[PDB]
Structures are given as structure tokens and as C-alpha cells.
Design a protein around this nucleic acid. Structure first.
Ligand code: CL
Ligand code: CL
Ligand code: CL
Ligand code: CL
Ligand code: MG
Ligand code: MG
Ligand code: MG
Ligand code: MG
Ligand code: MG
Ligand code: MG
Ligand code: MG
Ligand code: MG
Ligand code: MG
Ligand code: MG
Ligand code: MG
Lengths: 132, 122, 122, 122
RNA sequence: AGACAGCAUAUGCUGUCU
RNA sequence: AGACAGCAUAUGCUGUCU
């Protein structure tokens, strides 16, 4: 039982994002998208455990999960310089409703560490970036 | 004045029923009573109403500035499951963070019969 | 590119509608275009975005550093009364100082039917 | 110009309401008035604005440099308690230092009904 | 839906201290 | 550069009333 008590495996990107979702208010907000985006980059970087630990450390300072994710996007080394992923959509009406008003023209050189979550591209080759 | 008598006075100033603010008023009233600052708490609450702000603003202000409350951890409240949490409180439940305090808006920690927990956040 | 088309492009980078930054975009687009410096203004804007600053920061920076704006008096715009100013701008209205300029964050001077003036500040 | 009218004039240049700068504007207007220097005070304020400085910077500068304010003790303002202090000033209350003076950025000393003091600092 | 209220985040501008 | 503060905008969450 002691092995079972103390064993803490690294989480998959999907399990990581699900844990984050439990601390966030609402559903399909820009923070939910960021949680999925960051979880994927953290995982592929081999930093799933470090990222989750850093997330909890910020929370333990009294900050909520929204403040934690934006701080991590700013400071966590696996995110520095990283470009937001491009996501194909039929059109921009397809972007989750609570995200739509956070859409902006793509700047020339968008990065996660400046608050750019993802870039949506439509079937017409148009693009918008999701900004927190 | 008792913890329960205090809480009902506050209820007369709050819109609706069993909202997060109702729970907060109950949680604060108990802590205030136990610290012996039950009188001082109510006066502070009235003082703020006089200044033109409402009850919600009074409770959040007091929860952040009232001596008795600063640093205090939200209490654990047993429920059968999270759908027996009062309905106007259910969409304000989150995972419990490591160090919740009432002065940041954490009202209480609900624990289920499975030993799972959620925190009520204003 | 016309002043009008310049402002429409800048609007694609801006959050909200009719904010003080929308007004500033329109005011700077007109001044830039009249200076014959429309191409240079748009290039300097993009160059700033490309350094990682957002569009709001780029417009205030251009207002402070783009030669064609230094010491320029904000344009006077006639309005029925200050309730007619766009809602998101009304809280940013101040008494007109002596010697307002664009480079110090003064966007425009609203002039009411009754002859009073307020200046919009970013 | 009376202390009240002077403060009213200054208020038209300030953002928000009941900020520490509104309290300073009232404090300085009274001191200038009492010393027969309201005219010179208003002129010095306008002069600084006409250099492109904003109203907040003008008031902090005048508090430091205008002769009528040098070494003046901030006025003591009696209040029920510190919840009575305007909300935008509350986070700017500090312990009263040794020898508070207007020219070192201390605006006023609030004295609670229970004999405690805190000073408002810009 | 809207109005109001409370909470949070991001950005800009300003001021003070180190 | 950081800490803190003030003001504004934008967005999101929750509650009530209609
Ligand atoms: Cl219980
Ligand atoms: Cl005063
Ligand atoms: Cl007199
Ligand atoms: Cl007197
Ligand atoms: Mg299609
Ligand atoms: Mg009620
Ligand atoms: Mg919008
Ligand atoms: Mg008006
Ligand atoms: Mg004002
Ligand atoms: Mg929260
Ligand atoms: Mg500074
Ligand atoms: Mg210093
Ligand atoms: Mg020093
Ligand atoms: Mg809402
Ligand atoms: Mg709601």
C-alpha cells in the first residue's frame, strides 16, 4: 500500500488538462483553451510533472487558477518563445462562444509568453489569434 | 447575540435564498461569534451599509478586512453528494486549492460521502 | 492607404469597440496621412507589434515617438453634449489642460454646443 | 478663491473620485487658502500643467516645492474607524512616521474614535 | 435576453517607494 | 528593474431582479 500511497506518475497532456479544468470557473473559456495548449507543450517537453508542481506552487501562494496559468505562460521555461498552435476551423463562428470576443488579428510574431493562446485558421485562409 | 441570530439578520439584507452570500453570512457569523467579535461584526456590517454600499459588498469587504476573518481557513461542511449543495451555490464550486482562506473568497469546503471535496468560491 | 482604411486595419488589432484606443487610432491615422507618412506609420506600427508589444502599447508608443505627432494639438471634435461622447470614452474625459498635445496622451478635444470643452486622455 | 472652489477646480483635472489625490487636493487648497496663497497656488498648478505634466504630478510636485506647504504637519482628520476612510485611499494608509510633513508625501493623519492613527501616504 | 450586483483576468495610462 | 497604489478599457465567471 505504501507504494500506492506515495507513487505519483506524470500525467498525460489530456489528464493534465482535465485536472486544470477542475480549478477553472465556467466552460470553454479562453483559460480552458490555454490549459489544453500549455498541457500539450509541457507534456511533449518532458515537463508534465514540473508544470503541475509549478501550477500548485502558485495556487499555494493564494492566487487562483486563472492567475496561475497566465503566470506560467509568462515564466515557465518550456513556454518561452514557443509559438501558439494553429487550429483549423470551418469559420470563426465555430470558435467556442466564450472565446469569440477575445479574437484579434494575428500579430506578426505571436508567442505563448505574450498571452497568445492559439491561432484559428478558417476554410478561406483567414486567421484570428486568441488573446488573454 | 448568537451565531444563528446574527446570520438571519444578515439574510434580511441579501437577495434570493441559499446563494453563496447566504453561506458566507453563515460562515462569517459563526467565526465572529466564536472570536467574541459578534457585536463588533454586526456594527461593522451596518456601518458599511450606511456608506451606500450593499450587503454583498459589505460581506466581501468584511471578509477581507475584518480582524476575526483575516487568515482564517474555510470550514469543511459534509454533504451527501455535490448535487445536494444548495442549487444557487453549485456553479461556484471548484477544486480545493492548497491554502484557501476566507479573505480571498473561499467560503467553505464541501466534502462528499466519497470523501471528495469542492470549495465554494465568491 | 487612406486615413479611413488605415483606421479599419488598426481596428482589427483592438479589443472592444469605440474605446479611447479606437478614437486614437482614427486621430493618428488622419494626422499620419496628412503628413504624407501613412506608409511609414503603418510600418512602424507593425514593427512594434513584431517586437511583442500589443496594439494598444504600439499606439501609445507611436503617439510618444512618431515624429509627425510630436507637439501636435489634439483635433477639436464637435458634440451636442458630453453625454454624446461614446460610452467607453466618457470616463476618460478631463478638463482641457493648457497646451494639450497628442504626445502626452491627449487624443482629442470635445467641444459641446454650449461651448464647453473636455479633453480625452489615454 | 475659497478653499472649496479651489479644490473643485482641481478635481476637474483628476481621474476617479475620492482618490488619495482628491484628499491631497483638498488638503493643499485649505493650507494655501489659510496662508493667503490660493492665487499663487492655482497659478503654480496651471504653470506645471502648461509644461505637459498631468494633475497628479503637479500636486505631488507642489506638495514638495511650494513654500506654503514646506514642513507643514498633515491635518488630523477624525473618523469613526478606518473603514470610514474612502475605499480608494484605504490601501495607502501606513503607520504615522516620526514627524510627518506635507512635503514628504504625507497627506493627512486619520485618528479613529478608539485613539488609533494611520497616515495617508502618496 | 436585459438590468443591477459581487468576483476574476488581461491591457493601457498615472503616481509612490526600493 | 521590482514592489506597491490609483484610474480606465476589455473579457470571463457567479448571483438576483425583470
Ligand atoms: Cl458537517
Ligand atoms: Cl480633506
Ligand atoms: Cl476664512
Ligand atoms: Cl477652518
Ligand atoms: Mg464549410
Ligand atoms: Mg434573502
Ligand atoms: Mg468585444
Ligand atoms: Mg457626460
Ligand atoms: Mg474625476
Ligand atoms: Mg476567482
Ligand atoms: Mg513608476
Ligand atoms: Mg525613491
Ligand atoms: Mg534607497
Ligand atoms: Mg455575466
Ligand atoms: Mg449570472
Amino acid at each position: 500500500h505504501m507504494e500506492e500511497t506515495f507513487s505519483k506518475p506524470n500525467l498525460s497532456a489530456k489528464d493534465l488538462a482535465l485536472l486544470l479544468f477542475t480549478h477553472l470557473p465556467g466552460n470553454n473559456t479562453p483559460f480552458h483553451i490555454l490549459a489544453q495548449v500549455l498541457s500539450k507543450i509541457a507534456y511533449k517537453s518532458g515537463k508534465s510533472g514540473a508544470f503541475l508542481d509549478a501550477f500548485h506552487q502558485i495556487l499555494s501562494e493564494g492566487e487562483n487558477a486563472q492567475a496561475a496559468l497566465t503566470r506560467l505562460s509568462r515564466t515557465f521555461d518550456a513556454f518561452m518563445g514557443v509559438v501558439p498552435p494553429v487550429i483549423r476551423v470551418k469559420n470563426f463562428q465555430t470558435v467556442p462562444r466564450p472565446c469569440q470576443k477575445s479574437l484579434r488579428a494575428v500579430p506578426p510574431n505571436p508567442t505563448i509568453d505574450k498571452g497568445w493562446v492559439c491561432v484559428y485558421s478558417s476554410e478561406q485562409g483567414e486567421t484570428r489569434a486568441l488573446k488573454i
